[PDB]
Amino acid sequence: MHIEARLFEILTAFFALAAVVYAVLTAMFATGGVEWAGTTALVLTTGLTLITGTFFRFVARRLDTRPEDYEDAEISDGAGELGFFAPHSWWPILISLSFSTAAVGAALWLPWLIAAGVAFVITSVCGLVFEYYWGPEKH
Amino acid sequence: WSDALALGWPTGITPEAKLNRELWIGSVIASFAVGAIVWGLIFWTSAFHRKKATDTELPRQFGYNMPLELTLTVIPFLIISVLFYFTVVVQERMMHKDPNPEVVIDVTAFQWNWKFGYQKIAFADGSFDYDGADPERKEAMTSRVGPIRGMTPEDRTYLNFDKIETLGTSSEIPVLVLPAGKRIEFVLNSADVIHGFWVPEFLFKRDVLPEPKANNSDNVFQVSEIQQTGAFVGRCTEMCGTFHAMMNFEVRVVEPNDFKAYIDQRNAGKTNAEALAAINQPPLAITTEPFESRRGELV
Amino acid sequence: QSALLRTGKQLFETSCVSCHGANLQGVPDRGPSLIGTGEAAVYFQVSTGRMPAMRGEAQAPSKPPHFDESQIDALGAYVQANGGGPTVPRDDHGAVAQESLIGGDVARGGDLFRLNCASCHNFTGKGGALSSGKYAPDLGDANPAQIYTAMLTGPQNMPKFSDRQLTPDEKRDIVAYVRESAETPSYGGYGLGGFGPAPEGMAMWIIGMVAAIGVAMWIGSRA
Amino acid sequence: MRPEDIDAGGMETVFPWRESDGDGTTVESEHKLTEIAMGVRNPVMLIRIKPADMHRVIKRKGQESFNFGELFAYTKVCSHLGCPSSLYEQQTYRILCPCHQSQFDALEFAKPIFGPAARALAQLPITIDEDGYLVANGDFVEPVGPAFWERK
Amino acid sequence: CSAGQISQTTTQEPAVNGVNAQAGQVSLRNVHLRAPQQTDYVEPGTTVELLFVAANDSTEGSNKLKSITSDVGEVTLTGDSTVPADGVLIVGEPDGQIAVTAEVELTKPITNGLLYDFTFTFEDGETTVAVPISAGEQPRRPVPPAGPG
Amino acid sequence: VDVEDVPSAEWGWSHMPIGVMHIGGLLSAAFLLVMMRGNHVGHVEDWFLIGFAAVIVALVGRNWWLRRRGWIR
Amino acid sequence: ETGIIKRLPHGAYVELHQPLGPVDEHGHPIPLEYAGAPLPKRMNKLGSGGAPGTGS
Amino acid sequence: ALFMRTELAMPGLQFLSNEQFNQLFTMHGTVMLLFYATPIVFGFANLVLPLQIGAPDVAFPRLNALSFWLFLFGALIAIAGFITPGGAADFGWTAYSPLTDAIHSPGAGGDLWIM
Ligand SMILES: CCCCCCCCCCC(=O)OC[C@H]1O[C@H](O[C@@H]2[C@H](O)[C@@H](O)[C@H](O)[C@@H](O[C@H]3O[C@H](CO[C@H]4O[C@H](CO[C@H]5O[C@H](CO)[C@@H](O)[C@H](O)[C@@H]5O[C@H]5O[C@H](CO)[C@@H](O)[C@H](O)[C@@H]5O)[C@@H](O)[C@H](O)[C@@H]4O)[C@@H](O)[C@H](O)[C@@H]3O)[C@@H]2OP(=O)(O)OC[C@@H](COC(=O)CCCCCCCC[C@H](C)CC)OC(=O)CCCCCCCCCC)[C@@H](O)[C@@H](O)[C@@H]1O
Ligand SMILES: CCCCCCCCCCCCCCCC(=O)OC[C@H]1O[C@H](O[C@@H]2[C@H](O)[C@@H](O)[C@H](O)[C@@H](O[C@H]3O[C@H](CO)[C@@H](O)[C@H](O)[C@@H]3O)[C@@H]2OP(=O)(O)OC[C@@H](COC(=O)CCCCCCCC[C@H](C)CCCCCCCC)OC(=O)CCCCCCCCCCCCCCC)[C@@H](O)[C@@H](O)[C@@H]1O
Ligand SMILES: CCCCCCCCCCCCCCCC(=O)OC[C@H]1O[C@H](O[C@@H]2[C@H](O)[C@@H](O)[C@H](O)[C@@H](O[C@H]3O[C@H](CO)[C@@H](O)[C@H](O)[C@@H]3O)[C@@H]2OP(=O)(O)OC[C@@H](COC(=O)CCCCCCCC[C@H](C)CCCCCCCC)OC(=O)CCCCCCCCCCCCCCC)[C@@H](O)[C@@H](O)[C@@H]1O
Ligand SMILES: CC(C)=CCC/C(C)=C/CC/C(C)=C/CC/C(C)=C/CC/C(C)=C/CC/C(C)=C/CC/C(C)=C/CC/C(C)=C/CC/C(C)=C/CC1=C(C)C(=O)c2ccccc2C1=O
Ligand SMILES: CC(C)=CCC/C(C)=C/CC/C(C)=C/CC/C(C)=C/CC/C(C)=C\CC/C(C)=C/CC/C(C)=C/CC/C(C)=C/CC/C(C)=C/CC1=C(C)C(=O)c2ccccc2C1=O
Ligand code: HEC
Ligand code: HEC
Ligand code: FES
Numbered sequence A: 001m002h003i004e005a006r007l008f009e010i011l012t013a014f015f016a017l018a019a020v021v022y023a024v025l026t027a028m029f030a031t032g033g034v035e036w037a038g039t040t041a042l043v044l045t046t047g048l049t050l051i052t053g054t055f056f057r058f059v060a061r062r063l064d065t066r067p068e069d070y071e072d073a074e075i076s077d078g079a080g081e082l083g084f085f086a087p088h089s090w091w092p093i094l095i096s097l098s099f100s101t102a103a104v105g106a107a108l109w110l111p112w113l114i115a116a117g118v119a120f121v122i123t124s125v126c127g128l129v130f131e132y133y134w135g136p137e138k139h
Numbered sequence B: 001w002s003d004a005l006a007l008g009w010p011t012g013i014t015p016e017a018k019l020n021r022e023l024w025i026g027s028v029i030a031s032f033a034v035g036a037i038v039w040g041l042i043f044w045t046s047a048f049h050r051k052k053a054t055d056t057e058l059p060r061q062f063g064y065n066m067p068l069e070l071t072l073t074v075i076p077f078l079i080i081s082v083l084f085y086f087t088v089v090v091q092e093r094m095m096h097k098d099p100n101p102e103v104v105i106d107v108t109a110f111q112w113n114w115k116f117g118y119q120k121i122a123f124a125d126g127s128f129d130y131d132g133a134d135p136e137r138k139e140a141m142t143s144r145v146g147p148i149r150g151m152t153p154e155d156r157t158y159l160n161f162d163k164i165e166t167l168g169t170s171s172e173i174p175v176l177v178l179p180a181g182k183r184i185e186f187v188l189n190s191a192d193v194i195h196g197f198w199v200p201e202f203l204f205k206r207d208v209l210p211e212p213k214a215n216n217s218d219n220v221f222q223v224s225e226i227q228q229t230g231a232f233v234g235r236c237t238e239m240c241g242t243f244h245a246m247m248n249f250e251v252r253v254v255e256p257n258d259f260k261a262y263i264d265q266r267n268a269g270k271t272n273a274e275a276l277a278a279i280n281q282p283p284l285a286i287t288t289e290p291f292e293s294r295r296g297e298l299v
Numbered sequence C: 001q002s003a004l005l006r007t008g009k010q011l012f013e014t015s016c017v018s019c020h021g022a023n024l025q026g027v028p029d030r031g032p033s034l035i036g037t038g039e040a041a042v043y044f045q046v047s048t049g050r051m052p053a054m055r056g057e058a059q060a061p062s063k064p065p066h067f068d069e070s071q072i073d074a075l076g077a078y079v080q081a082n083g084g085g086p087t088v089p090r091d092d093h094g095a096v097a098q099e100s101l102i103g104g105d106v107a108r109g110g111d112l113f114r115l116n117c118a119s120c121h122n123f124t125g126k127g128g129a130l131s132s133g134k135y136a137p138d139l140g141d142a143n144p145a146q147i148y149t150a151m152l153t154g155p156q157n158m159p160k161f162s163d164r165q166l167t168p169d170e171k172r173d174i175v176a177y178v179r180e181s182a183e184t185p186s187y188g189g190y191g192l193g194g195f196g197p198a199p200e201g202m203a204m205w206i207i208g209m210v211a212a213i214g215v216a217m218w219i220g221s222r223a
Numbered sequence D: 001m002r003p004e005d006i007d008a009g010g011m012e013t014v015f016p017w018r019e020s021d022g023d024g025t026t027v028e029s030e031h032k033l034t035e036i037a038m039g040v041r042n043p044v045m046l047i048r049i050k051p052a053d054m055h056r057v058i059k060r061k062g063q064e065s066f067n068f069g070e071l072f073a074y075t076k077v078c079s080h081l082g083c084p085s086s087l088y089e090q091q092t093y094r095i096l097c098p099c100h101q102s103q104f105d106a107l108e109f110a111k112p113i114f115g116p117a118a119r120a121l122a123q124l125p126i127t128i129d130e131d132g133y134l135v136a137n138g139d140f141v142e143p144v145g146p147a148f149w150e151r152k
Numbered sequence E: 001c002s003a004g005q006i007s008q009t010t011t012q013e014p015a016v017n018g019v020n021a022q023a024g025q026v027s028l029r030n031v032h033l034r035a036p037q038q039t040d041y042v043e044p045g046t047t048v049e050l051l052f053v054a055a056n057d058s059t060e061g062s063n064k065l066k067s068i069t070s071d072v073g074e075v076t077l078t079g080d081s082t083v084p085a086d087g088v089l090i091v092g093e094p095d096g097q098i099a100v101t102a103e104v105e106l107t108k109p110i111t112n113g114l115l116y117d118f119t120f121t122f123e124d125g126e127t128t129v130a131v132p133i134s135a136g137e138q139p140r141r142p143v144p145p146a147g148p149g
Numbered sequence F: 001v002d003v004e005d006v007p008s009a010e011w012g013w014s015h016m017p018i019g020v021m022h023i024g025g026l027l028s029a030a031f032l033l034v035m036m037r038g039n040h041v042g043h044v045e046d047w048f049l050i051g052f053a054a055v056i057v058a059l060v061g062r063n064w065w066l067r068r069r070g071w072i073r
Numbered sequence G: 001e002t003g004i005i006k007r008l009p010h011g012a013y014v015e016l017h018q019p020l021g022p023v024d025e026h027g028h029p030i031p032l033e034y035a036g037a038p039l040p041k042r043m044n045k046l047g048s049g050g051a052p053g054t055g056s
Numbered sequence H: 001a002l003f004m005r006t007e008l009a010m011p012g013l014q015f016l017s018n019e020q021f022n023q024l025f026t027m028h029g030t031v032m033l034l035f036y037a038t039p040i041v042f043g044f045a046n047l048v049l050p051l052q053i054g055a056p057d058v059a060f061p062r063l064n065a066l067s068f069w070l071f072l073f074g075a076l077i078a079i080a081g082f083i084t085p086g087g088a089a090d091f092g093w094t095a096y097s098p099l100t101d102a103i104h105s106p107g108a109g110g111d112l113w114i115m
């Protein structure tokens, strides 16, 4: 996955150059000195690509050429099990309802409704995480 | 024709406005030339490259022209570079501020109207000197520990006040009187929210901000002169609330002698309406009229 | 003090002329007249943060105050100088009276609150809903002076309680019940908002029945 | 109570009191005053319509002279089910019942305009005596409270 | 819906004991009569005070108040009744005011709670206000203690 | 109904006559319209009742026409 | 549905299914008849998850 | 936008107030940039992107479904400010400060818009 990491490094270099140039260009020319709200975002924008880019670099150097990373790869090269993909689940709609309940409580500033929403979110998230791991009932 | 290529821009009443309009016409000409070429290319291939009803074989499968791609990348870079230079040249002239202005205007914006004050008048020829600074009422807002650098959000010391002030009313459009052919300094200070000081004939506007110094905003702009007399309307351009659309104002331009006379009645306690009538001018705004209080025709 | 009147008009010119006019006559269909309202009305409306308003609706709701205590006094004096009206009570030092307005007989205040105040609000003063869009706000954040001025002035839809209909002693006793009932902790546990059966049933269904059903599925079996 | 004791836009519950009832210091007087407080049909709302809004007042037939100028007296008992309807809004002149949200237009003789109420609140005629105290100008012309099969 | 053209905060009138009136171009605010009372009627011959504030809507010219008449007696105006261009004309001194006054000599009995017609003319209007009787910051008058019954 | 429409057709009550739902729909709109006879002075609620009644009537008519023409069964 | 996606050598994407009863000639099972009882839909409920291990 | 466009046809407020018009473009912009334009970017992406790269599904099928419901309930909350008596947000989709402040925007419509 050499190309995947190269995309983020290209963005990392431009974001780093823009953050450094704009900081040094506002410290001596913008009224009031460095533009802080504005610079902080640019500096940490580089970090977003830096974290993803660095991780992709480390991952690429560990694994060899994948079937999708091979210029001339055959379809039969990728035969086998891919992994686990959830066939169906009604938990995600419950999580959204739980999160929306807390948001309405936060919007109207209802401490009881916020607490219920937080408890609903934890309960709904627990169901999503444990959906494919609950064992058979022991009776 | 400059009247059609301006796309509705006013002619302008200040040298900065005239320069800004010149840049607008040239940029529009450049934009139309580029647009015509692209539209012509799109129309040419849409009328002459249509599937002929006798062409069996599929067309040549070409998708890479390296000499062409480089050529059509440098050319757009050259056009923007040329425009950028003129952009920098014009904006430097428009934002230039003379260290010794002759008329200083305090523009105060609130919800939802305008207040105009004469901070200082000092004509270049020395025929009229005036000092409208009123320090006995600006420091009455001191409020002090304080949540922000020792002061409450209701500090309001950034606001400026003057002895002669034109206060807007829901039933009276505020009128700002300025001399013709004289440099005018505008100081913009809001009270609660952001407003917009826009005069379409000025071909320039700046947002009125509360606490501009704390926000690192240059709330002061100047015009070299006003080249003609008359009445010009001004509107609030930044959204500020319920009556954002019903807080317009008018700028009145008179001769320097008429402007000097008008200040005399204002100093003599006369209101804005009667002072304007004393210099043979309409007492109320003529470009704009106060909006009806009736929330609508169904009220 | 001429400085106080001039300062108040200076705030009025930049904050209130849009809906009340320059001479306090009121802009039709935008705002009523402030002549005769008095200092008490301005003090309450500004300290509670209600004014300046921002749009026309069923009720302008409460919000953080736009002016500090010094500016409220100047604003109230300017309006008081035009038409007179009721004035906010003050202590010996000349500040706004807060502690001295607490009555010593809460039992009388409770009955008075139930007769005259607990109709729009509830018993514990949590609030209530009015005809269409309008609603009575919570009384747990109002200081005694704000309650006194609200009784004196009669905000948007609130029958004005004059000093003759409700004497200052009765008003002092009424705010004593309001201030006491706000900070008395609930004796049977969590207050559940102090609204009555409506939160009790909701809490029941979401706690007792959820626990009872959840326990049942633990003890019981599926299929 | 005197007419000047209430400002414009105000509301205050009044009760039927007589000289023979007494001040309640004695045992007999207190018992007499108990039924006044415990009277189901006793409470009456006394509202003072603003003089600027007096031109919008619509009088009911047989009750045109039931007001003492800008002072109006309406029963506090809701005509629907008997709850005290004392949520009087001074500007909208709307009397709201907190039990089942019935709204009455105080300007239009307390005519119901919302909720399950279908009959207007009874109006009590009022006047002043020689001493300037507000007194009743007779009895209600219609029964007070919830309707029944034998009403009207 | 409640924020439409018909609002409940824009149609709201003043929460005072006065009357808002429009005499063509001059706005009358807080129009009320001050009259202490002891008996059910204020007997004729008792001097009362009529208080209001006149606001000039127009900001160009001035106006002057003349010939205030009513069917309650004779109204006497003392002082400079000229209202400035964009100012106020406060007549009388209401309670809570730390000099134009209107003096009324009653010819017929009046009482609190009723409406009495008044005529206001400045130069271009004849309007009726129906001025009521309003009590200011005066305390509640004592009531005699009832007997045992 | 049969198995392909309701798989558990023989395991319980799975069929409701279309006449009941069509008549109930007309009565649903009739009840919405008659409620305009009240003490309310406003007409915003009246238009909401009219719109809902019209929507219900349109749905009932659409279903009846489709059932009559044989497009749906 | 086990939720496991397997790519066939010719590129077909199929999901591994766990039959609830007997199977016909090839992989596909013979359809069972509904008996009014709940039918498992999660492979973890059938014991495919195993046990974490005896201990504290 | 049609209500706004039909109001800006003739000078004067025929059927809309200033507050209603202010709520109109705020909600119009919010709905038509964030509730229509942004989701349909992932609307087409959930359609063909797994097909384009020859994939059988998305990386996180459960998380993909969570995004739809979270978005749908989030969009409904902001629109739900209209049913409030004060109205929905009336300060514009750029929600400039301090207009969006409690002092200048005290209604619950703006609060529901934020959440
Ligand atoms: C089958 C059912 C289907 C429906 C059809 C069948 C029924 C339709 C047929 C009729 C029917 O409904 O009957 C059943 C009912 O019967 C009895 O009701 C009758 C009548 O109807 C009532 O309206 C009436 O109000 C009752 O008088 C009482 O008020 C009178 C006054 O009021 C008049 O004024 C009112 C308001 O104004 C005035 O207000 C105040 C009054 O002083 C003052 O402030 C003031 O004066 C004011 O006036 C002003 O006026 C002018 C202004 O302009 C000016 O002058 C001035 O300014 C002044 O100020 C209005 O609001 C009223 O409407 C009315 O007009 C007083 O005069 C009385 O003294 C008393 O207090 C009266 O009672 P009575 O005479 O006592 O008895 C008679 C007898 C009933 O006869 C029957 O036919 C019975 C047979 C038929 C019914 C079924 C039973 C038989 C079937 C078998 C048993 C089954 C096996 O009794 C009984 O046997 C009843 C027994 C119990 C029932 C058993 C059922 C079975 C049990 C098991 C189920 C009561 O018992 C009710 O409870 C009962 O429901
Ligand atoms: C097996 C199951 C069986 C057991 C289950 C039972 C558990 C019960 C849980 C709670 C138990 C608490 C016991 C102690 C009670 C106590 O001693 O309490 C003190 C005081 O505290 C509150 O005073 C607040 C301030 O202190 C005052 O200063 C302030 O004035 C006051 O304000 C009111 O008064 C003002 C005027 O004065 C008004 O202006 C204002 O408006 C208002 O009215 C305030 O009160 P208020 O806002 O009510 O709540 C504020 C609450 C914030 O909410 C809440 O806790 C909400 C959460 C619980 C409430 C009940 C559930 C309701 C359900 C939802 C409604 C669901 C709805 C969703 C809809 C979905 C579907 C619909 C379609 O903060 C807190 O307490 C913080 C504490 C947090 C505790 C968290 C619990 C810990 C659980 C951990 C478990 C671990 C176990 C693991 C084992 C292995 C008031 O109560 C006072 O009366 C009371 O006196
Ligand atoms: C395609 C689907 C749907 C299409 C709909 C989309 C477009 C609809 C357009 C509607 C117009 C909206 C205008 C908005 C702005 C507005 O509102 O400004 C009007 C003013 O009006 C009121 O003043 C009136 C006067 O102007 C004042 O002069 C006067 O004083 C005042 O009088 C009161 O006050 C006085 C004191 O002053 C009292 O004395 C007096 O007694 C009284 O009380 C007046 O009030 P009043 O008569 O109440 O009328 C209020 C409004 C009323 O608004 C409204 O549209 C309310 C909302 C109605 C919308 C319908 C709901 C839709 C149904 C569901 C969604 C179904 C779901 C679908 C199912 C699933 C899908 C499967 C198919 O009238 C109108 O706008 C005109 C009505 C025309 C609307 C037509 C729509 C009907 C539905 C048709 C459906 C057909 C479907 C068939 C399909 C085959 C006051 O409010 C003012 O402030 C306010 O300013
Ligand atoms: C199942 C049923 C009702 C069948 C009846 C069929 C029939 C013969 C109908 C004809 C008769 C008619 C016309 C009936 C109309 C209905 C009616 C008016 C009924 C009157 C009394 C009656 C029979 C009531 C039945 C109520 C009932 C069966 C409720 C079921 C609710 C269940 C199963 C809940 C458990 C699930 C659960 C743990 C959910 C979480 C908790 C929550 C949020 C529950 C919802 C909830 C509820 C249910 C409240 O009651 C409530 C009250 C006050 C405040 C809040 C809540 C609240 O949030
Ligand atoms: C018949 C009738 C009265 C209905 C009309 C009113 C109506 C439309 C109801 C809903 C009101 C709402 C939710 C308005 C706010 C705007 C909004 C976000 C609504 C729609 C949004 C939407 C369509 C989707 C967003 C996502 C979604 C669907 C979830 C919403 C989550 C929420 C918060 C729903 C609950 C709404 C609701 C009506 C429940 C109230 C629960 C009750 C009765 C509790 C009463 C109660 C009170 C009052 C306390 O004070 C209290 C204090 C301390 C502890 C407990 C309580 C307590 O339980
Ligand atoms: C319905 C007619 C009410 C009656 C009866 C009482 N109050 Fe009220 N109250 C009502 C409204 C509509 C409002 C808000 C008006 C507005 O313009 O916002 C209020 C407000 C108050 C407050 C202010 C609380 C705060 O802002 O934090 C207080 C302190 C208050 N009201 C007190 C009060 C008392 C003491 C009452 C009995 C004499 C009483 N209210 C009755 C509506 C109504
Ligand atoms: C338009 C947005 C307004 C601004 C600007 C100011 N006020 Fe106001 N006010 C407005 C309305 C629509 C009303 C009546 C109903 C209501 O919302 O309160 C008022 C009323 C008052 C009152 C009470 C009047 C009474 O009779 O009790 C007072 C004391 C008041 N207004 C004062 C006030 C002040 C001090 C302002 C500047 C901060 C101000 N108003 C601005 C609408 C508007
Ligand atoms: S009891 Fe008064 S409304 Fe039903």
Ligand SMILES: [Ca+2]
Residues within 6 Å of the ligand: H006, H007, H008, H009, H010, H011, H012, H013, H014
């Ligand atoms: Ca229009």
Ligand SMILES: [Cu+2]
Residues within 6 Å of the ligand: B110, B112, B194, B195, B196, B236, B237, B238, B239, B240, B241, B244, B247
């Ligand atoms: Cu503005």
Ligand SMILES: [Cu+2]
Residues within 6 Å of the ligand: B194, B195, B196, B236, B237, B238, B239, B240, B241, B243, B244, B245
């Ligand atoms: Cu604006």
